[PDB]
């Protein structure tokens, strides 16, 4: 064949920390379908947003948003344990069906995204070139996010622990833990990996009695 009808750009969703995770690669022949299992970002998270994206960038914000929906009713569990299956199905008319199903709760939500959605031919060419020019930056970005995500998790787990420790945590430790939580929050906004790990450390050094109480 000299002609193949294909999806011109990668299709996927946003995942924790502002990353695009692809479900269907660019230039895949239609019709096509793929499924992947995702989970929650935080302990006891009761809902997830499925933000559907088209593009080749690793930073979700630089790809084209196609649509979004929420899936609620996720029962309490530690982060990463719920099994949310996301399926992308592009039919022969180019219509994109996206569904998300929570295997434990049985709850499911879906959207339909029409064939004309997304980037036009000119923006497609530009997207491919843009991802090529940013390949190395996007590699550094993915590394930065894995550290940001650890920092986010430590911040949340420490906060929960402070709450349930309540009264049995000395006011000296609480004000030190408080300051270090704020400092970690500040670091988490920037793109310096060492900065973030450094504030995680400073938090761990004031958390010893908390860790004892929590355990």
């Amino acid at each position: 064949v000299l002609l193949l009808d294909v999806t011109p750009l990668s299709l996927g969703i946003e995942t924790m920390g502002g990353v695009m995770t692809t479900l269907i690669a660019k230039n895949t022949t239609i019709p096509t379908k793929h499924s992947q299992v995702f989970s929650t970002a935080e302990d006891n998270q009761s809902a997830v947003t499925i933000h559907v994206l088209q593009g080749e960038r690793k930073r979700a914000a630089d790809n084209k948003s196609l649509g979004q929906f929420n899936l609620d009713g996720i029962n309490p569990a530690p982060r990463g344990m719920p099994q949310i299956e996301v399926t992308f199905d592009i039919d022969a008319d180019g219509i994109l069906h996206v569904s998300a199903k929570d295997k434990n709760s049985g709850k499911e939500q879906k959207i339909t995204i029409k064939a004309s959605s997304g980037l036009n031919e000119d923006e497609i060419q530009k997207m491919v070139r843009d991802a090529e020019a940013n390949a190395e930056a996007d590699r550094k970005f993915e590394e930065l996010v894995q550290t940001r995500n650890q920092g986010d998790h430590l911040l949340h787990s420490t906060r929960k622990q402070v709450e349930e420790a309540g009264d049995k945590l000395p006011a000296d430790d609480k004000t030190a833990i408080e300051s270090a939580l704020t400092a970690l929050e500040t670091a988490l906004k920037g793109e310096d990996k060492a900065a973030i790990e450094a504030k995680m450390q400073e938090l761990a050094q004031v958390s010893q009695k908390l860790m004892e109480i929590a355990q």
Binding site: I13, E14, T15, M16, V19, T21, F38, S39, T40, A41, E42, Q45, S46, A47, V48, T49, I50, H51, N70, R79, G80, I84, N149
Partner: peptide, 9 residues
């Protein structure tokens, strides 16, 4: 991987 929660109010 992991999914965000819906944007809070």
């Amino acid at each position: 991987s992991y999914l965000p929660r819906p944007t809070p109010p």
